[PDB]
Design a protein around this ligand. Structure first.
Ligand SMILES: CC(C)CCC[C@@H](C)[C@H]1CC[C@H]2[C@@H]3CC=C4C[C@@H](O)CC[C@]4(C)[C@H]3CC[C@]12C
Ligand SMILES: CC(C)CCC[C@@H](C)[C@H]1CC[C@H]2[C@@H]3CC=C4C[C@@H](O)CC[C@]4(C)[C@H]3CC[C@]12C
Ligand SMILES: *C/C=C(C)/C=C/C=C(C)/C=C/C1=C(C)CCCC1(C)C
Length: 224
């Protein structure tokens, strides 16, 4: 039979919705009482984006577009394509990284997503996986560069530290997405719902939580 999202998946998403929404509102207000405002904006956008994406996924878990006999909840790629770049930025600001380099990490990132999307809608397993590799290779490149701003002597010693910190956290976490993907969206061995929940779990770690980390860090440092 076909693997399609259910009330369950819906639930999960709906839950994520609320969280995102709150963070959005939270930061959304907070910002008006700071100096520094930018860092806030970044994360406001991020969560507002997600919130929206999840909101769509949730209300339409029934309107199924399918690759094979398994529904693909693509809205997430959109989210990701927009959010992921903003997440890297959240860290980039803690560094003195050069525009030229920024564009590279970002560009890499964007493709990482698209490849995923490409694979997500591919029939031939033969290609599906090729695409998968691609993205991983992008996540790779991308990650590599992010670390050059670690050892290569280029902001303040406080920042540098916080940066390193958050990065290792983001760096590791992210590799989970591709793993989960590979499993469901990619292989099929994973349910649409479970994938949703898993992805969902990740998102909340990757976005709201990370956000706080950053905001704090900034707020913290700024106080020095
Ligand atoms: C899950 C969602 C609802 C979480 C939202 C968390 C928001 C409300 C949190 C996370 C970061 C937090 C801020 C971190 C740093 C400061 C500077 C400090 O001098 C006063 C508190 C203040 C300004 C915090 C206000 C509350 C804050 C903005
Ligand atoms: C959707 C609901 C849950 C959102 C609730 C958002 C609340 C927690 C957010 C929105 C406005 C925010 C406050 C905005 C202004 C200030 C004064 C500042 O000097 C310290 C942070 C502080 C005190 C913020 C604390 C966190 C705060 C109260
Ligand atoms: C808010 C969303 C976040 C932080 C999403 C992160 C997503 C990734 C790191 C995805 C990576 C993928 C690959 C490296 C290979 C192919 C499939 C993907 C798209 C899921």
């Amino acid at each position: 039979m076909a693997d399609v999202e259910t009330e369950t998946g819906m639930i999960a998403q709906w839950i994520v919705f609320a969280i995102m929404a709150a963070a959005a509102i939270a930061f959304g207000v907070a910002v008006h009482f700071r100096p520094l405002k930018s860092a806030y904006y970044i994360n406001i956008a991020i969560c507002t984006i997600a919130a929206t994406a999840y909101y769509a996924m949730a209300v339409n878990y029934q309107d199924l577009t399918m690759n094979g006999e398994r529904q693909v909840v693509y809205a997430r790629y959109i989210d990701w394509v927009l959010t992921t770049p903003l997440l890297l930025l959240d860290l980039i600001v803690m560094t003195k990284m050069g525009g030229v380099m920024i564009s590279w990490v970002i560009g890499a990132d964007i493709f990482m997503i698209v490849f995923g999307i490409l694979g997500a809608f591919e029939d031939e397993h033969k290609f599906k996986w090729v695409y998968f590799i691609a993205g991983c290779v992008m996540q790779a490149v991308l990650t590599y560069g992010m670390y050059n701003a670690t050892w290569k002597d280029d902001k303040s010693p406080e920042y540098h530290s916080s940066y390193v910190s958050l990065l290792v956290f983001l760096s590791i976490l992210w590799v989970f997405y591709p793993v989960v993907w590979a499993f469901g969206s990619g292989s099929g061995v994973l349910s649409v719902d479970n994938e949703a929940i898993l992805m969902g779990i990740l998102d909340v770690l990757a976005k709201p939580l990370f956000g706080m980390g950053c905001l704090i860090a900034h707020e913290t440092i700024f106080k020095k």
